[PDB]
């Protein structure tokens, strides 16, 4: 269901600005930011900018005094067009180009990730400008195993690169908590034998993103998710300073989709509905994101009929629902994305020159 | 992109180079040349069919100049389609607009610029050139799983145009990209025949044009059909119809897949489990996207090519697991900088690109177009 208000909102902000549409709320952005704050308590919250790197998303979240996570250039660039002072910020990407790391420094983020030594070799140059933070795994494409974390920072020691800490990423949308517990235990040990191995004690564990959100099948709230989470990072020595980068649980619930149909026929026993958006657009994570979002319509009335939801391209991968009951919409009507605020837009591409859903800031 | 009107084998190996060098990576690099060359070769292999390049596969302006130069027509699917022919000066009767389901918008757009062949496939489209039945001829599409309606459905479209005063200008079909079997062609022109007729003995207006669509197959990894052969079923199929009929098709992957090269330099490397891998500057949210949004697969080298010959993985630049180009391919060993080139890479690749991460796009670097 969505509320006369919500209703009267997405029916308004169509008026002004056409369709396709991606209604931002700020509200729900500052919502969810505080709601991770207060169940992971003195964590520095990192907003990764990968799922969602939108200007007014940076100026809401850094007036509620929330970090940055940054993965290249573009995304300095934008911080840095936004005045998000460098301290602030991380750099994640585990594999640069000397550029990438130059173009951070220049902006002036100092922190910056390697899981091998190939990676560590680019840091030699630099040595008195980084603090490296060694991302472990324990999927297949980045992380080193624990046993050559400590290889690389030994390896850092004789090249007297510094070494911030370890960091990890479970997978986005975790929707078990007991990951992130068994990779902070993990974290914890590789930590010990740093320091009874005569190198320098970490001082960070980066616990990544992947906190997940509701989309067609509701997730468990964000204080009971965290709350193992908690408790396994209160045996990590207190001087042990912790970060996390979420994306995903900020950005997601805080966009909704508006599409309106463009046509539609009669195929096979259903109606095809072919909407302005797609595949191609906001529901690329259906391809790269492997989504499903809740769709609803603001017409509720009269048999439900069983249908599909295309997009705007002429390609047949462009489907959205290949088998969704709706009522009957005419030609206009509009479609409606929840929880659409992640990998949506982001990956979105140009094909066949369709214009991209413009996104509309609520409650800035 | 941009263009260069001035300037494995020995040649493409130092032209890759060179670019690299003064471009910097990814690159697409686009030969006019071939352009040109695999116009011609359709263009010989279906004898007066009217090619009408798609330009959804490969939105290029150089491309549009080339062929324009050559004696193509166009096929157009939206304003923004239609935005780049018109500002490359093709002239709007050189132009079908062939999205069945178009906003009025869209209708006034290609109208605007003077683009006045439309598709439908059904009658809630058709219903949508009340306000335009003096200024547009539609072709009806038919299919054989998104669009298209049935030969009965067809004739239900056509008399309904004709109580309402819209002009038909014909029929057409697209039996599906890559299609490495003629006789899908040959099944529809053949149903086609049948409602042409029809609509004859119905004592409609007889329709004018055939429009046999796109689908054309190329050479990925493994070989298709020849050109020749594969068209010499159709031609057989198309001189059953009356010679006043004309033929139209809609080539895209055909002629432009061929004429680009892709070009990724290695931005660094690990071994992971066995393993090299290299994480390229390119991937799946680039110029590979066609790994994922056209099921593809690309012939792969090195400019390498050289001794002992490691289990390797190539991955894209972007930190999603997703974004892998090849898993255990066997590469000599390469340094971080060394090119990994991509053949076959014209055809829904970097039509289909994304901003993720804000990685920047391969650029493309237009050759020999004069
Ligand atoms: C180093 C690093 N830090 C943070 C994130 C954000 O994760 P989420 O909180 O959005 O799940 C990510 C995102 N990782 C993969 C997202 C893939 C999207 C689905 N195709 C990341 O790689
Ligand atoms: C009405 C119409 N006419 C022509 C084309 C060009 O077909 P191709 O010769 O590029 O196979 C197309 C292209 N369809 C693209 C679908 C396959 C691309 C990969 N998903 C089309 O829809």
Request: charged share 20%; aromatic share 8%; hydrophobic share 40%.
């Amino acid at each position: 269901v969505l509320s006369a208000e919500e209703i009267h909102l997405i029916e308004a902000s169509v008026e002004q600005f056409g369709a396709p549409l991606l209604l931002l709320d700020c509200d729900v952005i500052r919502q969810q930011y505080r709601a991770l704050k207060n169940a992971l308590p003195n964590v520095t919250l990192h907003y990764a900018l990968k799922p969602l790197p939108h200007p007014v998303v940076v100026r809401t979240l850094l007036a509620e005094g929330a970090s940055f996570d940054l993965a290249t250039t573009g995304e300095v660039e934008l911080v840095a067009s936004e005045g998000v002072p460098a301290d602030l910020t991380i750099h994640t990407h585990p594999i640069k180009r000397d550029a990438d790391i130059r173009d951070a420094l220049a902006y002036g983020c100092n922190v910056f990730v390697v899981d091998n030594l190939n990676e560590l070799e680019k840091f030699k140059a630099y040595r008195d400008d980084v603090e490296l933070l060694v991302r472990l795994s324990f999927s297949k494409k980045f992380g080193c195993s624990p046993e050559q974390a400590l290889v690389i920072i030994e390896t850092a020691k004789e090249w007297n690169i510094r070494i911030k800490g370890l960091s990890f990423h479970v997978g986005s949308q975790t929707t078990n908590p007991n990951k992130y517990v068994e990779a902070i235990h993990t974290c914890r040990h590789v930590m010990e034998q740093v320091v009874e191995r005569g190198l320098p004690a970490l001082s960070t564990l980066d616990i990544g993103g992947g906190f997940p959100v509701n989309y067609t099948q509701q997730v468990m709230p964000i204080d009971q998710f965290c709350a193992p989470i908690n408790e396994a990072l209160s045996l990590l020595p207190e001087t042990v300073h912790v970060l996390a980068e979420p994306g995903r649980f900020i950005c997601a619930p805080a966009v909704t989709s508006v599409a309106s149909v463009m046509g539609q026929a009669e195929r096979e026993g259903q109606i095809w509905y072919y909407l302005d958006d797609g595949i191609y657009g906001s529901f690329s994570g259906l391809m790269f994101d492997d989504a499903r979002y809740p769709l609803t319509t603001i017409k509720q009335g009269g048999e439900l009929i069983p249908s599909v939801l295309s997009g705007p391209t002429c390609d047949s991968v462009d489907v959205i629902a290949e088998n969704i009951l709706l009522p009957k919409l005419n030609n206009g009507d509009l479609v409606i994305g929840r929880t659409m605020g992640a990998y949506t837009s982001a990956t979105a591409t140009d094909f066949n020159f369709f214009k991209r859903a413009q996104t509309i800031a609520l409650n800035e």
